[PDB]
Design a protein around this ligand. Structure first.
Ligand code: BOG
Ligand code: BOG
Length: 326
C-alpha cells in the first residue's frame, strides 16, 4: 500500500514526505533535508529535486540521476534508500524526492599509512564497480567522497580542478576510465603529504605543475596525439624529465610511492586500472579478490535519445513505481 504523507514548510518550499521520515532540518541548497528514518533507524538525506521537469534537458537529467542511483548497489558507492512522490498518478506527477544515507563528513596533521591504505582501498573498490558498469565518474575529488566514523567510505555523484586528469583540461574527449585513476592519485598524494599535489591557479598553471612532476610527453605518447596544434605546442616546450617520486613524497611507505608512480602517468593507456590497483601490495592487508564485486551492465542507451518532456517524465514515473528498497 501507499504511505501516509505529511506537509511542512522549510527551505522556502513545501515538503510532503512519508511520516516515517521525521524531524527534517534543512542542510543544503534541489534542496536537501536531514531526517531520521523511523522505520530503519537510519539518519538519511532527503533531496527534493528542484524543477525536475521544467524543460527537456531538466527532465532528461532527472531521469539520468534516478536511473544512476537505482543501479548503484555497492558498499563504497552511494545508493538509493528510497524514492517517492506525493502524486497518486502520472497526471499528478510533479515532484521527486530521493533518499540516501546521511553522511557525516567528506574527505575535504597527517593520516597514518594504515588509514591512507584503507581509504584509497575503498575508493578503488567502489571505482572497480563503477567502471565495470561502463560508467566514468569524471569528477572524483575529496568533496565527492563521504566517510562515517568507522572510516567507511562512499563515492558520491554530487569548481576545483586540482584532481582533474590532464586530458580533460586539454579537451581531449574519448576519455578512458583511467581519468578517474589520475584523480585517485592526486587524492592519495594529498592524504600522504597533507598538501594539494597540483594546486594550480588556472589550468595552464595546473598543467605546468603536472609536467614538472611527470615530465613532458615522450615520443611514444606523441604518436597517439592527433591534434596538430597540440603536438606543435608540446614539442616547443623545454624537455623536462620525470621526477623520482621518492624524492617528492619523502618518508612515505615505499609501496605507496610505487602505486602513485603507476597512477600518475600522463599516458592514460599506461595508468594502472582500479582492478589492478586493488591487487597491488600496498593494499595487502585489505585486498580480498572474492570480495571486490562488479556491477550488472548499465543501459545508458537513453543518452542517445531525444524525447519530449512528457516522455522523460513518464519514464521517470515508471522508475519511481518500480523501485524496490534495499
Ligand atoms: C596544449 C596546449 C596548451 C596551450 C597553453 C599555451 C600558453 C601557456 O603558457 C604560458 O605562456 C607563456 C609562454 O607562451 C609563459 O610565460 C608561461 O611559461 C606559461 O604560463
Ligand atoms: C602537455 C599535456 C599533455 C597531456 C597528455 C595526455 C595524454 C592522455 O593519454 C591518452 O588519452 C586518450 C584518451 O583516453 C587516449 O585516446 C590515448 O591513447 C592516450 O595516450
Amino acid at each position: 500500500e501507499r504511505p501516509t504523507f505529511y506537509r511542512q514548510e522549510l527551505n522556502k518550499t513545501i515538503w510532503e514526505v512519508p511520516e516515517r521520515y521525521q524531524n527534517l532540518s534543512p542542510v543544503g541548497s534541489g534542496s536537501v533535508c536531514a531526517a531520521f528514518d523511523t522505520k530503519t533507524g537510519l539518519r538519511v538525506a532527503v533531496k527534493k529535486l528542484s524543477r525536475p521537469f521544467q524543460s527537456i534537458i531538466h527532465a532528461k537529467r532527472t531521469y539520468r540521476e534516478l536511473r544512476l542511483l537505482k543501479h548503484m548497489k555497492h558498499e563504497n558507492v552511494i545508493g538509493l534508500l528510497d524514492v517517492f512522490t506525493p502524486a497518486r498518478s502520472l497526471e499528478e506527477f510533479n515532484d521527486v524526492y530521493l533518499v540516501t544515507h546521511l553522511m557525516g563528513a567528506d574527505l575535504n596533521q597527517k593520516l597514518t599509512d594504515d588509514h591512507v591504505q584503507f581509504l584509497i582501498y575503498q575508493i578503488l573498490r567502489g571505482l572497480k564497480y563503477i567502471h565495470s558498469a561502463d560508467i566514468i565518474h569524471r569528477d572524483l575529488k575529496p568533496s565527492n567522497l563521504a566517510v562515517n566514523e568507522d572510516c567507511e567510505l562512499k563515492i558520491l555523484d554530487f569548481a576545483t580542478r586540482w584532481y582533474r586528469a590532464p586530458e580533460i583540461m586539454l579537451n581531449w574527449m574519448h576519455y578512458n576510465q583511467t581519468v578517474d585513476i589520475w584523480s585517485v592519485g592526486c587524492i592519495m598524494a594529498e592524504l600522504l603529504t597533507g598538501r594539494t599535489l597540483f594546486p594550480g591557479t588556472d589550468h595552464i598553471d595546473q598543467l605546468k605543475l603536472i609536467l614538472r612532476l611527470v615530465g613532458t610527453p615522450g615520443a611514444e605518447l606523441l604518436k597517439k596525439i592527433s591534434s596538430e596544434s597540440a603536438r606543435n605546442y608540446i614539442q616547443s616546450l623545454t624537455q623536462m624529465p620525470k621526477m623520482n617520486f621518492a624524492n617528492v613524497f619523502i618518508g612515505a611507505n615505499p609501496l605507496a610511492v610505487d602505486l602513485l608512480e603507476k597512477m600518475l602517468v600522463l599516458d592514460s593507456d599506461k595508468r594502472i586500472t582500479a582492478a589492478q590497483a586493488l591487487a597491488h601490495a600496498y593494499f595487502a592487508q585489505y585486498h580480498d579478490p572474492d570480495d571486490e564485486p562488479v556491477a550488472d551492465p548499465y543501459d545508458q542507451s537513453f543518452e542517445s535519445r531525444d524525447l519530449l518532456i512528457d516522455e522523460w517524465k513518464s519514464l521517470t514515473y515508471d522508475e519511481v513505481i518500480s523501485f524496490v528498497p534495499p
